[PDB]
Amino acid sequence: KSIFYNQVGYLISGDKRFWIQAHEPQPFALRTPEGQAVFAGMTKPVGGNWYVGDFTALRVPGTYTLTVGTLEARVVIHRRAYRDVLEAMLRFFDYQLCGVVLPEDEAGPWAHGACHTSDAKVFGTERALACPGGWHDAGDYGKYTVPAAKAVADLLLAHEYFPAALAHVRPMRSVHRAPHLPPALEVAREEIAWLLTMQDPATGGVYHKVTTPSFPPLDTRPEDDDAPLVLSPISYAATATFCAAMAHAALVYRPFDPALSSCCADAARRAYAWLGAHEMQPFHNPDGILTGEYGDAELRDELLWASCALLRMTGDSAWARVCEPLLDLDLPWELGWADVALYGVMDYLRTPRAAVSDDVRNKVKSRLLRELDALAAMAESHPFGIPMRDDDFIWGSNMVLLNRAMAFLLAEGVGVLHPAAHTVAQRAADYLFGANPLGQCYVTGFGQRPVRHPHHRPSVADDVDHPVPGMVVGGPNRHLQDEIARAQLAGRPAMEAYIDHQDSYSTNEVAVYWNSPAVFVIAALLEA
Numbered sequence: 001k002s003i004f005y006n007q008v009g010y011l012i013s014g015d016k017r018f019w020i021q022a023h024e025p026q027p028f029a030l031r032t033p034e035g036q037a038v039f040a041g042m043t044k045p046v047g048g049n050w051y052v053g054d055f056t057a058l059r060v061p062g063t064y065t066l067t068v069g070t071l072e073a074r075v076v077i078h079r080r081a082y083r084d085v086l087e088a089m090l091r092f093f094d095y096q097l098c099g100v101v102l103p104e105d106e107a108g109p110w111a112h113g114a115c116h117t118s119d120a121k122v123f124g125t126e127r128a129l130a131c132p133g134g135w136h137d138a139g140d141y142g143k144y145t146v147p148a149a150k151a152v153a154d155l156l157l158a159h160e161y162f163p164a165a166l167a168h169v170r171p172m173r174s175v176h177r178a179p180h181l182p183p184a185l186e187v188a189r190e191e192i193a194w195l196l197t198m199q200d201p202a203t204g205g206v207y208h209k210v211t212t213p214s215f216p217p218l219d220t221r222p223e224d225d226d227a228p229l230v231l232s233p234i235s236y237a238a239t240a241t242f243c244a245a246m247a248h249a250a251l252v253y254r255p256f257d258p259a260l261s262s263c264c265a266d267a268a269r270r271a272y273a274w275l276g277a278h279e280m281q282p283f284h285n286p287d288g289i290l291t292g293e294y295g296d297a298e299l300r301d302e303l304l305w306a307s308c309a310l311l312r313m314t315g316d317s318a319w320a321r322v323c324e325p326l327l328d329l330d331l332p333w334e335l336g337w338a339d340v341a342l343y344g345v346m347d348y349l350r351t352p353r354a355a356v357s358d359d360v361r362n363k364v365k366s367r368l369l370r371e372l373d374a375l376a377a378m379a380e381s382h383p384f385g386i387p388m389r390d391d392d393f394i395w396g397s398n399m400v401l402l403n404r405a406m407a408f409l410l411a412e413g414v415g416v417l418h419p420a421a422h423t424v425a426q427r428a429a430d431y432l433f434g435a436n437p438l439g440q441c442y443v444t445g446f447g448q449r450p451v452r453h454p455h456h457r458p459s460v461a462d463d464v465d466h467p468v469p470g471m472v473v474g475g476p477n478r479h480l481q482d483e484i485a486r487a488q489l490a491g492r493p494a495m496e497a498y499i500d501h502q503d504s505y506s507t508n509e510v511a512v513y514w515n516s517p518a519v520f521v522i523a524a525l526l527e528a
């Protein structure tokens with residue numbers, strides 16, 4: 001029996017809330033560290049056992065003691081409460097670096113030598129290839145094209161939308177090339193550079209992944225993983241998500257790295273030439289390969305994103321001939337990793353009005369507004385005010401929640417101003433930081449109940465005790481898709497289907513595409 005609140009803190013000019021399981025409204029106070037009362041209010045019902053306490057009006061920064069009943073919590077008010085967590089969430093990408101020496105001056109206890117240096121065999125051939133750099137996908141050391149495209153798309157979007165907030169954070173600056181680009185672009189260049197090695201120079205097709213034939217033991221240090229590396233076959237999705245992320249990078253890097261920008265635009269075109277010459281065939285793990293499949297039977301949403309990305313890159317009206325029919329389909333307007341349509345929607349809507357049908361544009365703008373209203377309706381009925389239903393608590397539910405928060409924020413930039421946008425973003429950060437039924441801070445190294453045992457090979461393998469900070473875990477998953485979850489979590493409601501245990505990969509794994517929308521959301525809150 002306790003207080004559920006944002007364990008990282010609150011913004012001076014932002015919404016401040018706490019939750020408790022109660023039966024009636026209770027008086028509550030916020031005190032200074034000495035004990036003097038500064039704010040007083042009454043709790044109020046929100047659904048079931050849930051009562052809220054809103055202390056938004058308390059604008060004087062500081063470390064306050066919140067008291068309700070006999071319970072006590074330590075809360076923090078600061079003009080930049082989330083800067084530290086944002087910096088850590090952005091440094092996670094530098095911790096995930098493959099084939100790069102991470103020095104102790106930058107990485108501290110989690111420093112290591114260059115891992116996965118050896119070349120990879122192209123599956124079913126004797127041909128080898130060097131595909132170095134990039135990020136280890138998650139808790140495993142695999143490098144997967146499809147989810148990598150989402151991680152890049154998100155960081156580029158965060159820099160485009162919130163560069164002022166991102167300017168206050170510092171990545172592992174000493175491992176990147178000089179002159180130093182803005183923080184998010186410096187971190188994302190590494191993954192973009194790697195992604196280019198994945199494209200077949202012969203055809204323009206992109207390899208789905210570069211992984212060892214199977215998952216090594218959970219206790220493997222990055223440099224001790226020495227099984228042969230295999231390039232899984234070229235896939236439609238890998239190629240289409242690559243084209244999309246590459247054209248986006250071409251626009252963003254134009255004033256910062258013109259050579260990379262040019263290199264990315266040509267790589268996107270060749271990848272689009274591959275799409276029109278090939279069939280929409282889903283990927284399936286070939287015999288022997290037992291690593292993450294990242295499969296998807298629906299590939300029109302990837303074509304939509306790759307077309308719209310090139311439409312925004314070129315600014316050519318000719319591309320709308322291909323976008324506009326795809327924009328008419330009943331595809332889920334989502335932010336990945338498998339349903340990517342919203343990225344295409346965004347790219348289309350952020351293209352000059354002259355190159356698009358003003359009527360298709362309005363229909364697209366209207367669908368998005370209805371989509372936001374549906375997310376807003378869910379948040380209005382959820383006691384934590386998050387656009388979530390019990391059935392949305394799936395594998396990587398924190399990404400579902402963050403992508404939804406991110407959907408509201410992206411829309412603010414294409415004239416779709418929902419009155420719920422900022423509340424939803426605040427509630428999503430509160431949830432992530434401990435305002436959930438488990439009182440769990442879903443980020444490592446932060447809050448009073450941080451994640452101590454994630455499914456992360458460098459954090460399990462090392463003898464440090466504390467895991468790498470700034471890692472966002474998948475979160476509660478009702479399907480119980482691992483032995484530890486099947487064992488400990490049967491019968492538990494959707495939001496409580498989480499376990500802080502290293503073997504629970506379905507609720508406790510970390511990932512590059514789970515940290516990326518967190519970076520967007522946190523930067524949005526700081527900026528506004």
Ligand SMILES: OC[C@H]1CNC[C@@H](O)[C@@H]1O[C@@H]1O[C@H](CO)[C@@H](O)[C@H](O)[C@H]1O
Pocket residue numbers: 138139140215217218292503505509
């Ligand atoms: O479900 C597949 C994996 C999700 N990403 C990283 C992997 O570590 C997860 O996989 C499995 O790793 C296990 C945990 O040690 C090992 O037990 C298994 O034999 C793999 O399925």
Ligand SMILES: OC[C@H]1CNC[C@@H](O)[C@@H]1O[C@@H]1O[C@H](CO)[C@@H](O)[C@H](O)[C@H]1O
Pocket residue numbers: 137138139140142291292293294395396505509510511
């Ligand atoms: O758990 C994060 C990923 C670690 N590397 C291997 C991938 O299989 C893991 O991914 C997720 O895989 C799941 C199994 O197909 C899919 O259910 C999830 O939506 C992915 O996050």
Ligand SMILES: [Ca+2]
Pocket residue numbers: 296298299300301302338339340
């Ligand atoms: Ca898809």
Ligand SMILES: [Zn+2]
Pocket residue numbers: 097098099115116136141222
């Ligand atoms: Zn590596």
